[PDB]
Amino acid sequence: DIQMTQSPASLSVSVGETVTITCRASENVYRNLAWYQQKQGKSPQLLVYAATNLADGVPSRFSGSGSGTQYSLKINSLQSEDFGSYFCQHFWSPVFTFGAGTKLELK
Amino acid sequence: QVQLKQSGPGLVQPSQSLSITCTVSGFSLTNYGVHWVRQSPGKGLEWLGVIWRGGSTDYNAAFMSRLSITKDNSKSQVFFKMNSLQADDTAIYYCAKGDYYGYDAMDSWGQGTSVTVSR
Amino acid sequence: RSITLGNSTITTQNVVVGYGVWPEYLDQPTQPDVATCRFYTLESVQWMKNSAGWWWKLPDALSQMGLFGQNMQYHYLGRTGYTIHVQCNASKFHQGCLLVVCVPEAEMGCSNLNNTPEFSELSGGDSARMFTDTQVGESNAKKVQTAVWNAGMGVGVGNLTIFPHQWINLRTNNSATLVMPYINSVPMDNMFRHNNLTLMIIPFVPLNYSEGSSPYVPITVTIAPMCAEYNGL
Amino acid sequence: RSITLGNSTITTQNVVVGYGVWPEYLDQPTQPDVATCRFYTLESVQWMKNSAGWWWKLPDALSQMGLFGQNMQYHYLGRTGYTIHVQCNASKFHQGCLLVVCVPEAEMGCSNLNNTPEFSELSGGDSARMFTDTQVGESNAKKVQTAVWNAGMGVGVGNLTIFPHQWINLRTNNSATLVMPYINSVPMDNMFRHNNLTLMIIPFVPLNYSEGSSPYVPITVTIAPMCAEYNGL
Amino acid sequence: SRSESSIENFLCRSACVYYATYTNNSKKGFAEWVINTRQVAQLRRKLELFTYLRFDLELTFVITSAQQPSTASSVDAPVQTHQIMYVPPGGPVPTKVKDYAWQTSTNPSVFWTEGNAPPRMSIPFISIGNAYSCFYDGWTVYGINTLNNMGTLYMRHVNEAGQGPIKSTVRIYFKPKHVKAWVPRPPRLCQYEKQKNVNFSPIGVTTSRTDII
Amino acid sequence: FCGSAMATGKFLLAYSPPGAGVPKNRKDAMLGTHVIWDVGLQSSCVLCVPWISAAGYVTCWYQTNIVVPADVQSSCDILCFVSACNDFSVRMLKDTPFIR
């Protein structure tokens, strides 16, 4: 199957900077990548699907880009609710594998 | 609009079977497929299996003989079964619908039923 | 303006008709006209920013539509024409362009190279199936290859204007009406194993707006069977 | 001989018609004629030796009869005529006599003197209720006084020939046909709270045979609504 | 010049559609070809511009033989003879070389000895519906349409071998006649993967350039 | 429709006849007698029903959302009038109950 290597393992940024999280695939997935955001103690929420499209209630601060085997997610300006867990997950072929995960401390 | 929710045992003895039932509302099972994702704090998120909107299912390779997922279109219910339940399954379990605008991504997730397998 | 049929009424203000022919008529057949010639309005779909397309298989979308869904489950064969009204309503502050075609005999290609697509993934009864803009993976159960730049049929998507079509350009135009006759080889075919038309909507120039406008434009499809008849006693 | 209506066919070989009038026609009403003018044959009853009688309340006996039972549960009011064919077939070795009347507005009397008879004991939908030849007791729940020598309406049973009737005498005659127009005060009445006709069959001279013949003679009632219409849109 | 772009000048050409081999002694040598249009990829792209066709058919077989290596002792042979059986849609089908289905009466076949002109035969428009269909969105298994079934061909030697094994080839030539075409279609972009169906893998629209200007 | 001039949308106007139920869904409300009322084209729709002495419903349904440009309010209002189309037929005058 296809393994997703997500980097970095965690971050420590403040309110009001840019931040980039990339995750790399084992082979080509043809832009079939979804990004999830999870807060503490809840089910995850979908953020970006198919590597460019934003979800329904998600504001335009988030932005995803990439093609081939390297993809990335960018938040231009943080807010007071964008801390938690983030994952990337492909839906090319079973078995679908999730990313490792990252955290935002917001120190 | 109201969405899917689930209900399970909470605790189970080892080398037994496991049974959770996820029941949806607001949509029908003939248009969306439902997934099964296991959130374990030791291993992260893991994908178990799915039943597509046509009825044919597809499981993970490491849990082939243990999983059996089924649904019924009239009752708006799914049924999934896991057996033999070793000690590495102490995690929380989610059902979530797929095919968010035909893109095979998880749209909305259930509230989740945490399970623990020890005595 | 405000044309009525049966017990229903929609309103209009340009009509493109088929391949040059108006739909007309031909054991002995029976001709029902009193309870079926009415405007079945499908429930509307939303055109968002990063949307890709929709398709409806046409004598399948009216299969659970009440009385017409009882003439289909009582009668084996049948031949119909159709009359489609598509109208999306945006302001003067939105922009975009749709392509509204009506493909006869749109045989679609599966994602897996060896199999054929199954029944539920081709035709959603009274519910739109959607194109995507990425490729669909192959090792699944059974699905349709719905990359929009090949239109699902292995053909270039710009070449789809050979079928009877109409552009919806939100700068000038607003609505599109089509009239489609009976295009089939046998004079009367089974309606449970043959979808002889396929209405596709493909947004070429995608939607755009400034911050503050409504972030979705709805699309209303209204189908009405004309010159329908069955063979039965 | 072998007259047909819709998709049904019965056969005959003398017709007594109503009060001298043939049944004819009159928001604006709608007139259905293509799917209802057919011969609804009720399931037959058996005339034994010590039998006493039968009655059917007429626009109630067709309430679960398929498509006519869907025009009744969709439409509030309605006015119909009727055409009844009764025919019993015995050999030349049986003997007896029936009286076949059709009573308009046959209000029946309860067994208990203070109450009124309830709904199920008056009208059996597509199933015959039966007279008796004894008195019915009074301290029960609710029932009809069905002594046959008072015909259930408090009137002498010999005087029932003033209604449009026909004798069935097994020596000479075999069958009886009636035609009944619309007899009501208001021009269009509710069909769920009014049974404007009542078909009664009373054996005056009871059946007899020798040992060896068939000990029962069946009676077939065939009803067919003519000149029916409703008020609706 | 407008006469060359007509339908009749676009499709009344010949094409080697099948190439089969069969010996005489090897007890499993006889040819078989189900008549279809989706065989050769160059003719298929021309017949897929339209959805409903209606044509006669004219077949011509160029049959030749070649002497296989025999044992010894001066093999001398007479002239061979071939039998080309045509099974209409809904007929019996041979499974071996010596079977009943060759000797049947309602399957027309030609007999042809070597050294003459090749054996042409012509099939009229044989179907139940009013036209053939290159595409069929529906079920009969998805997208098969058993109504445009034109038949099958079978070939064999009719001389028993005395002292020499002989194998033969056959090239079937295919030529529509009096073609009518309805409801045209856009030409296929991607490659052909499987013979039965319309499956494909997505490729891009056009070859690319370095800039827009 | 007493709303803006730049806001469009659609509305169903289903009249359930006496005898049928109230529709509990948009889809079977479509299958009755109904008038699909476009807002952006015309600003007043007329629906004529009979009225006698269940007995009917005149329910109205959202077909699409209200599409609106920037710097226009989205919360619009709707008025409804009533009249008498043909001639009524009254009989047997009495006194009104809207009194002491």
Short mmCIF file of C-alpha atoms in Angstrom, two decimals, chain C residues 3 8 34 45 47 51 54 86 95 97 99 112 120 140 145 151 157 193 211:
data_model
loop_
_atom_site.label_atom_id
_atom_site.label_comp_id
_atom_site.label_asym_id
_atom_site.label_seq_id
_atom_site.Cartn_x
_atom_site.Cartn_y
_atom_site.Cartn_z
CA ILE C 3 -47.56 27.91 -19.32
CA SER C 8 -48.80 22.48 -12.57
CA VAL C 34 -54.42 13.28 -19.32
CA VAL C 45 -28.56 21.34 -7.09
CA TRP C 47 -23.37 25.42 -8.16
CA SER C 51 -17.97 22.42 -8.67
CA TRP C 54 -23.87 16.80 -12.87
CA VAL C 86 -32.96 24.42 -16.93
CA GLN C 95 -20.22 35.28 -13.31
CA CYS C 97 -20.83 29.68 -17.81
CA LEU C 99 -22.84 23.84 -20.94
CA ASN C 112 -11.40 -0.51 -13.19
CA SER C 120 -26.30 2.44 -8.58
CA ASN C 140 -12.38 -0.34 -5.27
CA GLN C 145 -14.39 7.07 -14.18
CA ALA C 151 -16.70 13.58 -19.88
CA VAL C 157 -15.08 17.50 -23.34
CA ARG C 193 -32.98 -1.73 -18.94
CA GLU C 211 -17.03 38.74 -0.55
#
